Structures are given as structure tokens and as C-alpha cells.
Design a protein around this ligand. Structure first.
Ligand SMILES: [Zn+2]
Ligand SMILES: [Zn+2]
Lengths: 191, 191
């Protein structure tokens, strides 16, 4: 049986998620959750996913970018967002910190807020500590689209969705995604 | 034939609309639009509607609350929100100003952002000047849900949607509308 995705409104998404006990990570229980998340993130075309999104108040995130997902987008664009593919990645009790105040601005979308995208600003470089799928402590460094995803998923673990971090007037239907930005809205890209 | 409501993304919604020339108000074109708006606002169950929502960069709003619309809601709620019914109302080149810093907090929804609602703070009392359907200077005073609607529609005329004015973490699917507010969130209602 597969637990589906919670949508905005469900308190689980707007409240800080409890840490999973290191070691208990190897548990057949939490291990199971990691499997589900990974499945769901792949079942609906998603590049990231946080425990609360399937109703689990735990600090666990999974991200992954297929060289196939990327394929379906303007090369001009995927290149601008420094979006390189990476293998599935799992992090429990992650702790994110920017490696520099360098930032970027692009359209983001959440699986708990579908049908909509919105330009949100993100750190370009970031380092995330925590534990790997098997309870061993790791420290992941990343930039570009990957850093973006990590920030997204981590935000979830704190009860935060991009909507409360978006650039005014950029909110839009996935359909009207490519329509121009109205005057005033900052330019997309980076410094 | 009636125009289709525009959804977020379409620049028309995120840019300041131009004032309509007084007098030109009686014009066919302009009196045509007012008819369309009114039709659309009624066609999809809506209580307000601004020109940009149908693609018209003009400053024209129509609001109306049926004793029928209201009927389909918790009387306890209709209470709290001071939501009383009022007849169709049309205002060109409206100019809104609060009558006091008295505010209220309730869930709002836009027709250009459907499937979602979010708690937004509004002035409780407000006065709006401008012109009536027939081009005559008018000055409407209102409070409660009516004041809320006026603010909503007027915001549209300036390229503003509630999403950029919502209370963090209140965003939600119309379905998850009644689910609790995450912890930390303000309490809905007045002061
Ligand atoms: Zn998300
Ligand atoms: Zn609206």
C-alpha cells in the first residue's frame, strides 16, 4: 500500500518535523519510509520529497535528478540554473547552511501545491550535514539546482512552503509559466 | 460570448490597470465590459471581480453578495466575518481607503488562483470613492465581508493577489480548508 502526498492545509506540512533517532535509522521501520518516499517522488514526476509530504513528522528527505528529467527542458534554461543530474540521495536529520550569500532566482514548484509555480530566491551554494540512508554521518556539499532542492526539502522539515518565500507577482499556473514577468519583478538567473 | 477568467501568470493581473475616462463610462465598449464582468462573476460562483481578471487593463470592479451565497455557510462563521448580503455593485476608477486601522483575519480565495484559499488580513472598515455604472461620482462605505471584497477587487486593479499578502502557513487546498492551523499561526477573526 502506498501513502500519497499531503496538500497544503494539512498541519503536518506547516509544523517543524521531529528528528529521527540516529541508529534507529537502520530500523526496518524508518527504512520502510525512505522506500515509500523514494517511490512517491518517482511516481509523480518529482525531484525532491520530504517526510511530512507523505504524512511523516520525521526529518528525512530524498532528492534525485535524472538526466531524463532534465532532458525535457530548454537547454538554455537548464544550463542557466546549473542543473546537473545526480543519483538518488537520502538524508535523515539534515542540517543545511549556505556556503555563501550568493543567490539565484528561478521558478520552483511543490508537490503539495500543484498546478502552480513561482519564482523563489535560493542560495547558490550550500552544505548539508546529517546521516545517510544507513545511519552513517555524512556531509553533502552542493550548488545549483541541487542546492535549490535541498533547501526546498529542508524547508518542508520546518513547516515552510515556497509560497511564503516567493517573489511577489511571480505566482502562476504551470500553464502560464512561460508568460512574461510584469514590470518590477526582478530578473531571473544569478549574480 | 463571455471571456474566460485569467489565471496567475498572465501579466494583465500583475500590472496596474489604467483609469477609465469618466463619461467614456457610458460608452458602449465600457458598458459592455461591465456586463461581461457581472456575467462571469455570476457564472462561476464569485462575489467580486476586477477588469484585469477578464483581460481588461481598466480600473473597474463588480461585487455582489447573494442571500443565497451566504446561505451555504456556517451561520456561526457568517457571523464572525460580519458577512451580510448586498446587491450587485459596480465601481469604475474606484479609490479605496480604510476608515480605521481595525482589522480582521479570514480565509480568502481568488478566481485567478482556484483550488486554494489562504488567511489574509483586511481592514474592517473602508470607504471607496469613484463612479457608478452610469458615470456618476459615488462614495461607498462598508465593513465586514463587504469591505474585504472591495479590498480584494481593488488590489487586483493594482496587480496584487492575496498570495503576496497571506499569513505564512495558512495557504491551503479548498479541501484542506477546515483542517487546523499549524502551530504559531494567528487566530482567525477580529481583535
Ligand atoms: Zn515541496
Ligand atoms: Zn480575485
Amino acid at each position: 500500500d502506498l501513502p500519497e502526498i499531503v496538500a497544503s492545509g494539512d498541519p503536518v506540512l506547516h509544523e517543524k518535523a521531529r528528528e529521527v533517532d540516529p541508529g534507529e535509522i537502520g530500523s526496518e521501520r524508518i527504512q520502510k519510509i525512505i522506500d515509500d518516499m523514494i517511490k512517491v517522488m518517482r511516481l509523480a514526476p518529482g525531484v525532491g520529497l520530504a517526510a511530512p509530504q507523505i504524512g511523516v513528522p520525521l526529518r528525512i528527505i530524498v532528492l534525485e535528478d535524472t538526466k531524463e528529467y532534465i532532458s525535457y527542458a530548454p537547454k538554455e534554461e537548464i544550463l542557466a540554473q546549473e542543473r546537473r543530474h545526480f543519483d538518488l540521495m537520502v538524508m535523515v536529520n539534515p542540517v543545511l547552511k549556505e556556503r555563501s550569500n550568493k543567490k539565484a532566482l528561478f521558478f520552483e514548484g511543490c508537490l503539495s501545491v500543484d498546478g502552480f509555480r513561482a519564482a523563489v530566491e535560493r542560495y547558490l551554494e550550500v552544505v548539508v550535514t546529517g546521516y545517510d540512508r544507513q545511519g552513517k554521518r555524512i556531509e553533502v556539499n552542493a550548488s545549483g539546482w541541487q542546492a535549490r532542492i535541498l533547501q526546498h526539502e529542508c524547508d518542508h522539515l520546518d513547516g515552510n512552503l515556497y509560497v511564503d518565500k516567493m517573489v511577489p507577482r511571480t505566482f502562476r499556473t504551470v500553464d502560464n509559466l512561460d508568460l512574461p514577468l510584469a514590470e518590477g519583478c526582478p530578473k531571473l538567473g544569478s549574480h
